[PDB]
């Protein structure tokens, strides 16, 4: 169950750092040109460090990923893209996992190439799962109840993610068909969009209200109501909240109203975010860092940097 898995991981890595793995065309292009020039150092690390993890865990395109160096030149453009896409992902994971509570993969980055990116996405989940590292698919899924069961299957049965993000504007009833499977008697964790990071997020989340309660608060309340009716907490899973690292006032409000809630915070001011949303159980406030790590000349060092800033902030907060 995810509450225990997340707890146990937090004890092991002693952080709330959530690493965002959102590879784009630039990243893969740059990875490919760098590898061709540094004697494939990172690809060689992925293959030879590192347990022979690829050969034991990967089920899609395994032989492409294992291609001998002389033979890379001869891959089709599609197979080459698949090669460097996967290897970039494995490189980031291998270099940063020592500092990572959880990895969050945003689905948007994986779908634009059709099947090739979804195959990569599956590989990434298989790879992380082989190390029991917590995972999340950030897909902001929504549809009517019977239809959303398809996303439940994709995310929790196919990818075997620990968690996902969900947009409940249609209604909270969808939660019963994402976070619970009656036939399997299984429960799954998720984070619902409460306050997002985009500049215009006030338009509906803040400007709309009911009896002087802003929309984001009403939506958090309705979400918790559904979570309680589902009895999800009793099953050691949770339905939490996405609250942007720039939404300091909303973070304070949500944390105070729901002191035991699990929060995901994308968008990293870091000190104010952590102070306002603080929980002694660090895993209940995930701080997502993606591009600052994945686009870094040195993602290990950079992940370390965020890891140390967080320690210092908790030192300061808990003084």
């Amino acid at each position: 169950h995810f509450k225990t898995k997340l707890k146990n991981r937090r004890n092991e890595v002693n952080t709330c750092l959530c690493i965002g793995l959102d590879p784009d065309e630039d990243d893969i292009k740059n990875f490919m040109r760098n590898e061709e020039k540094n004697g494939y150092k990172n690809v060689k690390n992925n293959m030879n460090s590192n347990n022979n993890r690829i050969e034991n865990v990967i089920k899609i395109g395994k032989e492409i990923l294992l291609t001998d160096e002389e033979n890379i030149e001869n891959l089709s453009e599609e197979d080459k893209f698949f090669y460097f896409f996967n290897h970039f992902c494995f490189y980031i994971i291998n270099n940063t996992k020592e500092y990572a509570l959880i990895y969050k993969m945003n689905f948007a980055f994986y779908i634009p190439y059709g099947s090739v990116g979804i195959n990569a996405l599956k590989n990434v989940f298989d790879y992380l799962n082989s190390m029991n590292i917590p995972t999340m698919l950030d897909m902001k899924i929504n549809d009517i109840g019977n239809t959303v069961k398809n996303y439940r299957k994709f995310i929790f049965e196919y990818l075997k993610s620990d968690s996902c993000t969900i947009n409940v504007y249609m209604g909270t009833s969808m939660l019963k068909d994402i976070c619970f499977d009656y036939e399997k008697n299984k429960y799954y964790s998720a984070y619902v969009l409460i306050k997002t990071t985009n500049k215009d997020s006030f338009i509906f989340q803040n400007e709309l209200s009911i009896n002087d309660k802003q929309a984001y608060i009403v939506m958090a309340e309705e979400t918790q109501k559904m979570a309680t009716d589902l009895k999800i907490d009793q099953n050691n899973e949770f339905i939490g909240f996405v609250v942007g690292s720039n939404a300091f006032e909303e973070m304070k409000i949500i944390r105070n109203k729901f002191p035991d809630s699990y929060i995901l915070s994308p968008g990293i001011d870091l000190y104010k975010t952590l102070k306002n949303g603080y929980n002694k159980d660090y895993e209940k406030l995930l701080i997502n860092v993606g591009r600052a790590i994945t686009k870094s000349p040195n993602p290990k060092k950079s992940s370390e940097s965020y890891y140390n800033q967080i320690i210092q902030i908790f030192k300061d907060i808990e003084n």
Copy 2:
């Protein structure tokens, strides 16, 4: 070009019928069992549609062209791909004479990973080869720079004419879905306004700004964005999804936005068309999915809705 393409299609088929193509495991199992005991009748029709599969399909073509003798040479996974694609082709072939547009809900295609996205790509390729209007119902949402990935998947990869969008995060995302600066291209879409699910009132109606319900506010903000983007000048549109069971909201939306494109899933049919009426029929799509795709005779069932709509328009238009 979509405003023109839809108008032209409406001129050919003379209906607002939108056919939902949402194949589930039941459908594919049933189709396979039926084909194996009717002598592959529908597969035969698919492939006889003059070599359309052979000329158009670029993914798993050899598998799809497998002779019925050799379908058991197919691994269970290839068989699944085979009947999934052929089921979709069978639906389209049997119903296209009555269809203004096909709406494919992304949810039905993703749960098998690559397999279903391959089939989805095939479905769009097939429809696009006949220039038939298409929509991907995916209810997309993210931050602007991230949503560009959805724009690429939907409008560049699949080459859909349209999609559905959830703007609860903000309307700024519309600029990165419905417009591509680098290519100078515009694309059409329908934004969620009033959904069909029983509990859609919690946020869509109960939330408000003083006297104006959320769904109205969201429709206004959407139109504001579309105007800012100059989408209409470029022969595209940003429209609204309004449930066929939401008669009251449909009336308010059509009255306030008399020239808007509306998609109505759910199908009462009379009240929907009456309340949401536009003399340009394409401006109120009536989506019918399961009632057609799960019918023992999808042609007759589609024909039935086609005729029902003809009769309603007779009644409404004096």
